[model samples]
Target: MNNKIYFTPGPSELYPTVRQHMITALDEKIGVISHRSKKFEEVYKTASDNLKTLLELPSNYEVLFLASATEIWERIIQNCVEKKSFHCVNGSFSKRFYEFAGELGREAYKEEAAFGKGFYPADITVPADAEIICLTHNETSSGVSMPVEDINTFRDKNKDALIFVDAVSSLPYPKFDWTKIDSVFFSVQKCFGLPAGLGVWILNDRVIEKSKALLAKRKSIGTYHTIPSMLEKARVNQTPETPNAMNIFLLGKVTGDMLQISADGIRKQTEEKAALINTYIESSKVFSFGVEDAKLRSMTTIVANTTMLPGEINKILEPFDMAVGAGYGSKKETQIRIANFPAHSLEQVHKLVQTLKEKIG
Candidate 1:
């Protein structure tokens, strides 16, 4: 199972303690725990508290567990948007978010940038008719990231629209100014270094009020997983349906472990590792940052253009006991992506750099 270290976009490497946690979860029989039991309630409280501490969330912010962050997309459109939504679409993931609104027959208006570019705050104008504005903090497909200041400025310009962020690949890293955002969501497998079953959605009180208003209007704000249902259950540390107790327990434990490493330490390490990667790529003739603007480049998913054929490069790196991600979607042949999650250490990343030098040399 430890045959190679994963540097792919997600479902990547495990945290150093994940093995022990897996054993612990099994030992405690976390899998069979009732969602209604006090034992499960204690687990939920621990995870919720640790996540709040991990993200520096305010007391009014509520954390709700879903099957995946993708589901949050539907919940948001149903609960928050009455008809129109504005999107700043930059890459595949963000594009999909925009498309999801359209598919639901909502009036989805998008201001799109090219794949390797980002949307500036000044260029976008959310319509007065729009009820929600979507911003992808880091676009996983093209390796472009919208700077946080854009969120601040966008909020200033749109007083009524809810500011939502898809931070699936960048959370526990972007020390977000929640004051500017009404909602943000992410899945566990990326930054949290757990398995891929849990999605974490945190929204401010204003968003709660939005849901309440939608419900009072007799709108279909969804049934079982509606924001009100989640809030009601979460009030007493529970979910409407049987939850992923195993992953929830593991999330609490890992988030607790992450608290010891602390957000600052994790960001510092990420910056250092990213510096090393960018530095090496700057000097290498075979690869370059996909996004031309340095400001737009992603810290977590570094997309690079490769002169070598994709299969050839991956094959060469494979034998070094390391794995690097192939390009996503259309960039499948001429590009590669490497994830810089908390699960990857400076030492391991440095070794990966050396292996790349040999493979691509």
Candidate 2:
């Protein structure tokens, strides 16, 4: 058997310590315990508290662990947007969210930006009646991070509208200002160095208050996604449903480990790793960054459109025990994404880059 390097955009490699924590938690007898029991509450509370500390979130924000990011998207539509939404779509993931909003029977207008183009905050034109402005903080498919300054300026113009952000891919590298965002959601599998099946939703007071008001008006709310309900359960250190307890345990362990390492340390390591990989990509004649604006690229996920077939690139990488992500959906045949999460060391990134250079040069 050979060790494999996972550079997939998501389900990125998990840290060995995190994996050990999961294994230990799983071996415990508490697996048979009811989720609502006191024992479960202790573990749940510990995980949630560690997350809050690591994220540096304000008191106004409440965190909930849900099933998946896609499910959280549905909750966003049900809880945040009352009537219409303004979506800034620059890449595939943002466009998918727009489609999700439409599926929920809500009116969503998109401000489309060309592929490889960074989001221009000035481009977002919210209607007077818009209830929410939805933006993807980082687009995994295109490897672009939205300009927070621009988004903040646009949100300032529409103070009444809530700002909902998707920070899945960027969470591990950049810390966001919860004060500027009403709600932010990300999956644990991406940057948190945990397995999939758990999504973290951080909600501001405004979202909670709005959800309560909607309930008062007898409006429909997501059965398990209502902010008030989730928070009420969270107050007791519990989830609204049977949670992925193992992953939650892993989350706690990773958070504690991260605390010791310090957030700044982790962030600096990621930034330096990204810079090193970007340097290699720039110098390599066979590979180039898909997004031209260096600032717009995601620090942990490097995407590049290849002149050769995507499968051919994968074939070249397979023998090296390296698994890179193909462009999502329609672009799968032409683009590849390299994930640079915490589980991957700088040396690992260099090895992957060197392998590519040797294979394609």
In terms of TM-score, the best-performing candidate is 1
Clashes of each: 0, 0
Give the per-residue lDDT digits (tens) of candidate 2, residues 39-76: 88988877788878888889988889898898888888
lDDT of 1 by residue, 21-114 (tens): 9899899888888899999999999999999998999987999999998899988898898889999888899989998998888989898999
Stretches of candidate 1 off by over 4 Å are none
True-structure RMSD for candidate 2? 1.7
Segments in model 2 whose C-alpha atoms lie over 4 Å from true places: none
TM-score attained by model 2: 0.95
The local distance difference test score of model 2 is 0.81
- The window of 10 residues in a row where model 1 has the poorest summed lDDT is 118-127
Candidate 2's displacement at residue 60, Å, is 0.8
